[PDB]
């Protein structure tokens, strides 16, 4: 199947009419904007691996190396819950769209799922999803009974919290799958894999619908555009790029020509014109997603920034980092 | 308002329950046990990530044997970069299990995230190599091509095996001292006997001291 792979390279990337920079040449940009650290959500005591913005735009979880999962109030810098984890080598976290469930995944090949609004007042694990053979790299939430999960053995699952077992399993990668993100139209998701490839899977069908390439190093950051028709990746080769689902090519390449440190996290805005990006040079960046510029710099960390997200309404930007300091920008 | 003056008294009790759980994950020197392939990595001290623990003279050590999918080490190794020392056990008997460790030592040392961590290189099954030179097969000259010109300074006793075991140890530290820059340096040993539960505490005191020489401006 060597020559059949060239049939995709002539039907997905050769059908381009132009580039994306020729579209956004005459567009008035944001030019130069600046965020500012409103809050400083201190309290963690090790490297912070993942955060997830809640549905009401005033709650967020944060997963850190010290074995704690902590829900915050983004207004009054207020901790809501302390969730002590089983295995402290956690690399991902999640927040349900209902706001009742959170879920972590670590090195122990296991997705725990915690219930926030129990009748006993605590936070307890609902269904512990064991069944992966590698480290868990990312986990999400479709509803309160469906959770997709990437892991470190080339397999993306699709669990069911009531039953407990994988209703689907997405095989077809070489290395690991390092990050995944569901769409707004929630019948599709995408996954950025550790073999420098990005796979578009499908929740309802079960097979991978598309496969995107182009990165040199391994993709450890993926997120959807809020229209559900595009997504932007970020790998360790210090370059970001935005693909598209209806065109299957690399339209926008968000390459910083003077940096060498690898992108760790990527999340679009609530409007689709602020590509936040958390790098390895101890500070974040802000990319105008239209014209591909460095419109802002969120330099407020001293170690590498590992997690970064923008709310549903568009209120804030909270970036966590390896110096245990998660910081809300606005 | 009695709501946010009590939803912030909650935040000052979830504050004080991490600085009492963060003063317990900073009292143990973590390690990273890392054998090659059935090289006696479980026979040096004695869920899916086998975390073994031991203490010697009131200093708690925690070793993290990662029995993952394979020995790729591409992404789970950066989670252990806040660690004191990697431990690289290798059986010195075989010759297909030494030249594979040479390819498995220039990946750990020449890296990006482990650039401040020093390997406490253990050597095991040397009493199955000294018991494999009296056998007289001894294909060290056959396996390693440049073995035949090697003296044996500064050492039962036999100068044929003393030149042999000092050859691979000088082959271990050859890829070490190429690019180490003084921040981290190998610490090779010799041994399957129980005299090495002190030989790590005696060696981690020269790993912290090589950091505090650079930390406190000496």
């Amino acid at each position, epitope marked *: 199947a060597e020559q059949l792979k060239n049939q995709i390279r002539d039907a997905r990337k050769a059908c381009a009419d132009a580039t994306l920079s020729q579209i956004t040449n005459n567009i008035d940009p944001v030019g130069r904007i600046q965020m500012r650290t409103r809050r400083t959500l201190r309290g963690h005591l090790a490297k912070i691996y993942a955060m997830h913005w809640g549905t009401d735009s005033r709650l967020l979880v944060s997963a850190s190396q010290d074995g704690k999962l902590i829900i915050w109030d983004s207004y*009054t810098t207020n901790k809501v*819950h302390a969730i002590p984890l089983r295995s402290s080598w956690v690399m991902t976290c999640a927040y349900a769209p209902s706001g009742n469930y959170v879920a972590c995944g670590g090195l122990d090949n296991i997705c725990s799922i915690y219930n926030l609004k129990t009748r*006993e007042g605590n936070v307890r694990v609902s269904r512990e999803l064991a069944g992966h053979t590698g480290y868990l790299s990312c986990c999400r939430f479709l509803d309160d009974n469906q959770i997709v999960t990437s892991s470190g053995d080339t397999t993306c699952a699709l669990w069911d919290i009531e039953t407990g077992q994988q209703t689907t399993t997405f095989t077809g990668h070489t290395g690991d799958v390092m990050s995944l993100s569901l769409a707004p139209d929630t019948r599709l998701f995408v996954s950025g894999a550790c073999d420098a490839s990005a796979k578009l899977w499908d929740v309802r069908e079960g097979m991978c619908r598309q496969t995107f390439t182009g990165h040199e190093s391994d993709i450890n950051a993926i997120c959807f555009f809020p229209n559900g028709n595009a997504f932007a990746t970020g790998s360790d080769d210090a370059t970001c790029r935005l693909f598209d689902l209806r065109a299957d090519q690399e339209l926008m390449t968000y390459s910083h020509d003077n940096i060498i440190c690898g992108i760790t996290s990527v999340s679009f805005s609530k409007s689709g014109r602020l590509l936040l990006a958390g790098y390895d040079d101890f500070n974040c960046n802000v990319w105008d997603a239209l014209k591909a510029d460095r419109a802002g710099v969120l330099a407020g960390h001293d170690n590498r920034v590992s997690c970064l997200g923008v709310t549903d309404d568009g209120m804030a930007v909270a970036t966590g980092s390896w110096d245990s300091f998660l910081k809300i920008w606005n | *308002s009695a709501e946010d003056k009590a939803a912030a008294e*909650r935040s000052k009790m979830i504050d004080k329950n991490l600085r009492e759980d963060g003063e317990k994950a900073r009292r143990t020197l973590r390690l990273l046990l890392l054998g090659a392939d059935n090289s006696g990595k479980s026979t040096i001290v004695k869920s899916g990530i086998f975390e073994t623990k031991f203490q010697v003279d009131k200093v708690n050590f925690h070793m993290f044997d990662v029995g993952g999918e394979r020995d790729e080490r591409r992404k789970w190794i950066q989670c252990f970069n806040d660690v004191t020392a990697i431990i690289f056990v290798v059986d010195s008997s075989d010759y297909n299990r030494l030249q594979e460790a040479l390819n498995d030592f220039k990946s750990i040392w020449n890296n990006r995230w482990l650039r401040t961590i020093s390997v406490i290189l253990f050597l095991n099954k040397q009493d199955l190599l000294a018991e494999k030179v009296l056998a007289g097969k001894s294909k060290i000259e056959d396996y390693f091509p440049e073995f035949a010109r090697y003296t044996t300074p500064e050492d039962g006793e036999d100068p044929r095996v003393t030149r042999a075991k000092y050859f691979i140890r000088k082959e271990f530290v050859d890829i070490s001292t190429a690019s180490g820059d003084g921040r981290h340096i190998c610490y090779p040993h010799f041994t399957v006997d129980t005299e090495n539960a002190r030989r790590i505490f005696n060696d981690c005191k020269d790993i912290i001291l090589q950091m505090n020489l650079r930390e406190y401006n000496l």
Partner: single-chain antibody
Amino acid sequence: VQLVESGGGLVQPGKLSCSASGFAFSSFGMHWVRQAPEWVAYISSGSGTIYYADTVKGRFTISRDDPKNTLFLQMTSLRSEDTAMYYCVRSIYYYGSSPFDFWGQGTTLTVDIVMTQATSSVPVTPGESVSISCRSSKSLLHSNGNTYLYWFLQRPGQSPQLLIYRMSNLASGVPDRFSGSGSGTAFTLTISRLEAEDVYYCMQHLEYP
């Protein structure tokens, strides 16, 4: 999931114990609302905040206890105003939380901001979409914007519950026939499609008595 109080002491004027068997009561506030035939305290978990009552404020004490969850009051100069049924509340606050999502027992011991609507003699008939409306003086578009509003459910049974917290939202364990709408310094509560087992109370929460 469960909570209980104990007591109902009949004594001359001048200690009723709770027990949260099955709860996380080291992470709960502990009120005691009177509603005599309106609080006592707000002893929060991590006892550095003990409010007291408008009738005494220096006695009728109430002592926190964490491990066995021994929330009680102390009988210190009991008056004829606390001759009531104290409902210990499993209320604790964070953005998303429901004060009075759970409630204790009406232990029934027979010992400020004005939101005045008594209406204490109203017979009930089913079918009609009735609407009670307790409005208040100050604009409850607060500094945090969260209205500490007044519509708490009850029943002919010996223990209360909650219908409409922050003038709109429904509690845990109660039905969903209750509802409501509002604006600044107002509330129009729409309790419609009536049925059997449907008193009713409206009190504030903004400041300690």
